Design a protein around this ligand. Structure first.
Ligand SMILES: CC(=O)N[C@@H]1[C@@H](O)[C@H](O[C@@H]2O[C@H](CO)[C@@H](O[C@@H]3O[C@H](CO[C@H]4O[C@H](CO)[C@@H](O)[C@H](O)[C@@H]4O)[C@@H](O)[C@H](O[C@H]4O[C@H](CO)[C@@H](O)[C@H](O)[C@@H]4O)[C@@H]3O)[C@H](O)[C@H]2NC(C)=O)[C@@H](CO[C@@H]2O[C@@H](C)[C@@H](O)[C@@H](O)[C@@H]2O)O[C@H]1O
Ligand code: NI
Length: 158
């Protein structure tokens, strides 16, 4: 089991960490959501699907920087919605093919009433999403830690 990004970085068998940059709507009002869909950027596969089933959760999602200070959020994982930052590890998604499948995570971030001006700075860390991978075969229990960075400034008009 391993993962890669559309930019080309990879996290190998056994887990590890990678940085992912995302494009953000440059203007967002109170009552509107920024949607950060990672399913177009993070892809994973099972290396031995004939004999092993891989189980994949969103173990935790954490906010940083301007998202932590200026937004409230939800995360959608595989069709179910949860608070973001998260309050518990999600149910598992089965990975059962060598063919890359997206990691089905999307953040929905909405400005708090005190947000105004540059609410997320270009280049800054906005979130960490931890993918936990286990299987039905051995003791393997690995973390794939995705550090999410804003490409661009996001402004909340005053
Ligand atoms: C009828 C019968 O029972 N046949 C059994 C064979 O099927 C069995 O072969 C196993 O098959 C498994 C697949 O289920 C393989 O596990 C994978 O191994 C990957 C690493 O393999 C290389 O490195 C090994 C040494 O470390 C070396 O032995 C191999 O030759 C390879 O070069 C590993 O990366 C992979 O795990 C990753 O991917 C999965 C799926 O996505 C994730 O869930 C994991 O988290 C991880 O990311 C997986 O573990 C074995 O490679 C393969 N071995 C061989 C030699 O072909 C054999 C093997 O014996 C078994 O393995 C040893 C170590 C020991 O525990 C034995 O008791 C086991 O039975 O046995 C036959 O009987
Ligand atoms: Ni592979």
């Amino acid at each position: 089991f391993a993962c890669k990004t559309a930019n080309g970085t990879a996290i190998p068998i056994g887990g590890g960490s990678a940085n992912v940059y995302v494009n953000l709507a440059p203007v967002v009002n109170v009552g509107q959501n920024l949607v950060v869909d990672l399913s177009t950027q993070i892809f994973c596969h099972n290396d031995y699907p004939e004999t092993i089933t891989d189980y994949v959760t969103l173990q935790r999602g954490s906010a940083y920087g301007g998202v932590l200070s200026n937004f409230s959020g939800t995360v959608k994982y595989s069709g179910s919605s949860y608070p973001f930052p998260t309050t518990s590890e999600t149910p598992r998604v089965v990975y059962n093919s060598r063919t890359d499948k997206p990691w089905p995570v999307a953040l929905y971030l909405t400005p708090v009433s005190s947000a105004g001006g540059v609410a997320i700075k270009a280049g800054s860390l906005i979130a960490v999403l931890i993918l936990r991978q286990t299987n039905n075969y051995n003791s393997d229990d690995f973390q794939f830690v995705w550090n999410i960075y804003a490409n661009n400034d996001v402004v909340v008009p005053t």
